Scaffold this active site. Structure first.
Site, PDB file in Angstrom:
ATOM      1  N   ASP A  10      39.154 -46.558  -0.644  1.00  0.00           N
ATOM      2  CA  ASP A  10      40.200 -45.946  -1.433  1.00  0.00           C
ATOM      3  C   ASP A  10      40.967 -47.129  -1.986  1.00  0.00           C
ATOM      4  O   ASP A  10      41.633 -47.840  -1.244  1.00  0.00           O
ATOM      5  CB  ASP A  10      41.104 -45.088  -0.551  1.00  0.00           C
ATOM      6  CG  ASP A  10      42.346 -44.598  -1.277  1.00  0.00           C
ATOM      7  OD1 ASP A  10      42.489 -44.872  -2.482  1.00  0.00           O
ATOM      8  OD2 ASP A  10      43.182 -43.935  -0.635  1.00  0.00           O
ATOM      9  N   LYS A  71      46.262 -51.618 -10.362  1.00  0.00           N
ATOM     10  CA  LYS A  71      45.705 -50.281 -10.609  1.00  0.00           C
ATOM     11  C   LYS A  71      46.437 -49.589 -11.782  1.00  0.00           C
ATOM     12  O   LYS A  71      45.841 -48.781 -12.484  1.00  0.00           O
ATOM     13  CB  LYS A  71      45.772 -49.415  -9.341  1.00  0.00           C
ATOM     14  CG  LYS A  71      45.018 -48.094  -9.488  1.00  0.00           C
ATOM     15  CD  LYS A  71      44.964 -47.363  -8.180  1.00  0.00           C
ATOM     16  CE  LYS A  71      44.322 -46.016  -8.291  1.00  0.00           C
ATOM     17  NZ  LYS A  71      44.375 -45.289  -7.002  1.00  0.00           N
ATOM     18  N   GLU A 175      39.792 -39.141  -6.639  1.00  0.00           N
ATOM     19  CA  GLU A 175      40.588 -39.074  -5.406  1.00  0.00           C
ATOM     20  C   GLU A 175      40.760 -37.642  -4.888  1.00  0.00           C
ATOM     21  O   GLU A 175      40.414 -37.419  -3.727  1.00  0.00           O
ATOM     22  CB  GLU A 175      41.933 -39.796  -5.542  1.00  0.00           C
ATOM     23  CG  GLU A 175      41.777 -41.301  -5.544  1.00  0.00           C
ATOM     24  CD  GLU A 175      42.899 -42.079  -6.196  1.00  0.00           C
ATOM     25  OE1 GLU A 175      44.053 -41.591  -6.205  1.00  0.00           O
ATOM     26  OE2 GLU A 175      42.623 -43.198  -6.681  1.00  0.00           O
ATOM     27  N   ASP A 199      49.183 -35.101  -3.721  1.00  0.00           N
ATOM     28  CA  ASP A 199      49.093 -36.521  -3.385  1.00  0.00           C
ATOM     29  C   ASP A 199      50.428 -37.275  -3.589  1.00  0.00           C
ATOM     30  O   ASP A 199      50.756 -37.667  -4.711  1.00  0.00           O
ATOM     31  CB  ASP A 199      47.939 -37.167  -4.193  1.00  0.00           C
ATOM     32  CG  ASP A 199      47.627 -38.620  -3.865  1.00  0.00           C
ATOM     33  OD1 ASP A 199      48.364 -39.219  -3.053  1.00  0.00           O
ATOM     34  OD2 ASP A 199      46.659 -39.169  -4.445  1.00  0.00           O
TER      35      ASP A 199
END
Ligand SMILES: COc1cccc2ncnc(N[C@@H]3C[C@H](CO)[C@@H](O)[C@H]3O)c12
Ligand SMILES: [Mg+2]
Lengths: 381, 115
Positions: A10, A71, A175, A199
């Site tokens: 991840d 990211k 994800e 999330d």
């Protein structure tokens, strides 16, 4: 070293996690410091390059040359609004290399620029080495996760980071799909399933609606807040304490960075205590001008200081439901991902919104995505 | 609470503080060495450009020392000591003040070099 299994990684904005399915179960691998998650931090110093915990641990010493959040840049154009808005909050500089962002640092006394996929490849190399140190075997194959909203360029830039890291990227999966796999939501008997993935971790808030039919994951919609997480909940407790210290001692500790840091560190720990207890106590000797600060906070006060932020999480849920063209009663499963979903009030708000419906929260929220990527990795091994 | 009521539980807190005191002493030794190296640069033959570099390598090491002292404070701040733990409370207060006196010394170094 002999050849090892395939791993699930991840790759997060602030933290990454690697898992391995072995002996009938997923094992989340602890790093060299014993941590089950590793900071997505790369530090450039006069003498060396540091990754993960070693990079985060020296951020206060070397803020400009410690990169994180690659990211938020990966696969993006320089002029992208996200890039332009984000670079005002980063201590490291982001330059324009013919339309592509590059992070400019000082490394071994020289000015050097790196593409976001190169920073992410050093983070992926770290996750690979963590897996190898535990397994005592070479790790080449990996399933790497990406947000569902990622575009072709962003997905390709993540795959390139895997390639530069010497990994064989078997599969790049979304994800929320990984989170759904971890709970085995694709293996449930019946018609098509509508899944909501909530999330809230690593400074981002992502809501995704998936429809799973005959193992086909379909992302109906995505919503969220690019900047929202535990750091905001922490700040509210910090504001509360600064105000309390002003009322009690008539002194403003806000301009003393060290005093604010001691307080912020204690608040983040108190916040964690408030997820399983209704009260947390703090004792800080000589916090500011020799004054000892001994205090406590209830879960109720913590919830009130964050009421707008906690309530604000339902707007994205409402937006995602409207974009997916679904009523809230049409959602078969709700999954909690990210460390901040451990907050009872957030769980309460989401369960009440979904009319007493039980949440899938038994897998550690911080590890659920790597867990699902590891299961997938084993199916592809 | 009562006098002469030393408990085994407090021995555990005192042990944590003694380990921290020992870590503070090692960090302090590093501070003293930085101090000798500073005098070394000032009393040596480094020309202006190389002196600037040596003071900046020294600056990064002084920032590392400050960070270690800050990490000690954050570790001491995790302690919750019952009011009856008088010895632990006195030791915690003295160690925090000693670390703060060392921080003020780091600041005289840090603010005076590689600005
Ligand atoms: C290990 O984390 C926790 C354990 C137990 C309870 C927690 N409650 C809230 N946030 C937590 N963690 C937060 C997740 C978030 C990730 O960036 C951070 O702000 C953490 O403080 C909790
Ligand atoms: Mg300086």
């Amino acid at each position: 070293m002999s050849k090892g299994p395939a791993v699930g990684i991840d790759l997060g904005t602030t933290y990454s996690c690697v898992g391995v399915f072995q002996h009938g179960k997923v094992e989340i691998i602890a790093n060299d410091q014993g941590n089950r998650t590793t900071p997505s931090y790369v530090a450039f110093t006069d003498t060396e390059r540091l990754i993960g915990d070693a990079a985060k641990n020296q951020v206060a010493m070397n803020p400009t040359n410690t990169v994180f959040d690659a990211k938020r840049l990966i696969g993006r154009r320089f002029d992208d609004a996200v890039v332009q808005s984000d670079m005002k909050h980063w201590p490291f500089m982001v330059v324009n290399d013919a339309g592509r962002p590059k992070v400019q640092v000082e490394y071994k006394g020289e000015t050097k620029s790196f593409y976001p996929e190169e920073v992410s490849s050093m983070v992926l190399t770290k996750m690979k080495e963590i897996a190898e140190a535990y397994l005592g075997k070479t790790v080449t194959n990996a399933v790497v996760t990406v947000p569902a909203y990622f575009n072709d360029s962003q997905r390709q830039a993540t795959k390139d980071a895997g390639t530069i890291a010497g990994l064989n990227v078997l599969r790049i999966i979304n994800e929320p799909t990984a989170a759904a796999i971890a709970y085995g939501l694709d293996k449930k008997v019946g018609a098509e399933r509508n899944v909501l993935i909530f999330d809230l971790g690593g400074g981002t808030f992502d809501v995704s609606i998936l429809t799973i039919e005959d193992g086909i994951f379909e992302v109906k919609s995505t919503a969220g807040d690019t900047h929202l997480g535990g750091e905001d909940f922490d700040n509210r407790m910090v504001n509360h304490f600064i105000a309390e210290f002003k009322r009690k001692h008539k002194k403003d500790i806000s301009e003393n960075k060290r005093a604010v840091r001691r307080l912020r560190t204690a608040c983040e720990r108190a916040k964690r205590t408030l997820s399983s207890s209704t009260q947390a106590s703090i004792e800080i000797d000589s916090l500011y001008e020799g004054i000892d600060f001994y205090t406590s906070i209830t879960r109720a006060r913590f919830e009130e200081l964050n009421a707008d932020l906690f309530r604000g999480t339902l707007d994205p849920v409402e937006k995602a439901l409207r974009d997916a063209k679904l009523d809230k009663s049409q959602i078969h499963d709700i999954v909690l991902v990210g460390g901040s979903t451990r907050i009872p009030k957030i769980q309460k708000l989401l369960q009440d919104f979904f009319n007493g419906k039980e949440l899938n929260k038994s897998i550690n929220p911080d590890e659920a995505v790597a867990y699902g990527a590891a299961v997938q990795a084993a199916i592809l091994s | 609470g009562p006098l002469g009521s030393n408990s085994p539980q407090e021995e555990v807190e005192l042990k944590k503080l003694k380990h921290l005191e020992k870590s503070v002493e090692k960090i302090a030794d590093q501070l003293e060495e930085l101090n000798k190296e500073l005098t070394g640069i000032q009393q040596g033959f480094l020309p202006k450009d190389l002196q600037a570099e040596a003071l900046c390598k020294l600056d990064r090491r002084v920032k590392a020392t400050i960070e270690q002292f800050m990490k000690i404070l954050e570790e001491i701040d995790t302690l919750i000591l019952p009011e009856n733990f008088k010895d632990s409370r006195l030791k915690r207060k003295g160690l925090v003040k000693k670390v703060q006196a060392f921080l003020a010394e780091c600041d005289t170094v840090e603010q005076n070099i590689c600005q």
